Design a protein that fits this description.
The complex is a heterodimer of chains A (124) and B (108). Chain A contains five helices and no strands. Chain A is mostly helical and 124 residues long. With 108 residues, chain B is mainly β. Chain B has one domain. In chain B, strands 3, 4, 6, 7 and 8 form a five-stranded antiparallel beta sheet that branches. Classes of the chains: A mainly alpha (124), B mainly beta (108). At the A-B interface, helix 2 and helix 4 of A face strand 4 and strand 5 of B. Bound molecules: a molecule of 2 linked components (GLC-FRU) and 2-acetamido-2-deoxy-beta-D-glucopyranose (2 copies). A molecule of 2 linked components (GLC-FRU) sits at the interface of chains B and A. Chain A: Keywords: Cytoplasmic vesicle, Fertilization, Signal. Chain A: Monomer. Homodimer. Molecules associate into dimers and then rapidly dissociate again. Interacts (as a monomer) with the egg vitelline layer protein VERL (via VERL repeats); each VERL chain can bind multiple copies of lysin.
Chain lengths: 124, 108
């Protein structure tokens, strides 16, 4: 559906924005977390984008339609950065740490963490 | 072929956490959450998936995929909790869809 350049532009910004927030949260709350628990939360960020891609596209398509002009890759960069910022992922980080529910770090998570954000698979 | 939970908060200002795990070989074509502010689609990937569910429509912002509980509802048994709820419909490649109830009781 969406041109590959536009998909990549979105994904790079969404993951960048989620990762920024996690780094900030870890500076305060990461001391007692293990390395694999930290990697699990990085995976949470990538998987959150995958899980919500369908409703991201609904919101993006409305915004793009509102441009009243043919879109360019910068339009998707911008919207991807808005998606990455307009959520407080600490509701998850705090909940998962406080309730001792950070997921067991499994190989399918490591596989996603090792991907370039541009290559993280999403479904339409 | 799917497992799920909801983790309810003690205050309307903190959203609930919905967590699902998808274990499948018939594939899952659609997942739609029926929220008080509309129908929200999600894509449940292999393994763990997560979503926030807001208790009040006053927590909505111009952002994708926000979901507000229906409610609050009084319940017949007692007057010390109210009920918040959404439902989910899972459309499978074969056979009838799975319908899920996601409920949170809030102390009063
Ligand atoms: O009917 C939903 C429809 O509304 C849009 C924008 O008008 O999104 C808003 O409503 C959704 C509820 O279904 C929320 O999930 C979302 O956060 C909110 O922006 C569309 O994205 C959607 O198709
Ligand atoms: C959501 O579910 C309610 C019943 O709980 C139903 O009345 C309504 O039609 C559903 N919404 C959509 C958009 O299907
Ligand atoms: C009140 O009713 C709700 C729903 O039926 C139940 O979850 C809760 O435990 C009840 N509280 C008491 C004190 O019985």
């Amino acid at each position: 559906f969406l041109n590959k350049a536009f998909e990549v532009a979105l994904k790079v910004q969404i993951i960048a924005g989620f990762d920024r927030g996690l780094v900030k949260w870890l500076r305060v709350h990461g001391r007692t977390l293990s390395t694999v628990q930290k990697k699990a939360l990085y995976f949470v960020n990538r998987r959150y984008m995958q899980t919500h891609w369908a409703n991201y596209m609904l919101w993006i398509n409305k915004k793009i339609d509102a441009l009243g002009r043919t879109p360019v890759v910068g339009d998707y960069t911008r919207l991807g950065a808005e998606i990455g910022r307009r959520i407080d992922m600490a509701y998850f980080y705090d909940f998962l740490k406080d309730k001792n529910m950070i997921p067991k770090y499994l190989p399918y998570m490591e596989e996603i963490n090792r991907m370039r954000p541009a290559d993280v698979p999403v479904k339409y | 072929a799917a497992d799920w939970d909801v983790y309810c908060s003690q205050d309307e200002s903190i959203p609930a956490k919905f967590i699902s795990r998808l274990v499948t070989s018939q594939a899952l074509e659609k997942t739609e959450i029926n929220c008080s502010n509309g129908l929200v689609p999600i894509t449940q990937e292999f393994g763990i998936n997560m979503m926030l569910i807001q208790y009040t429509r006053n927590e909505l912002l111009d952002s994708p995929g926000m979901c507000v509980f229906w409610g609050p509802y009084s319940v017949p048994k007692n007057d010390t909790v109210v009920l918040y709820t959404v439902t989910a419909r899972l459309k499978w490649s074969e056979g009838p869809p799975t319908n899920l109830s996601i409920q949170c009781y809030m102390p009063k």
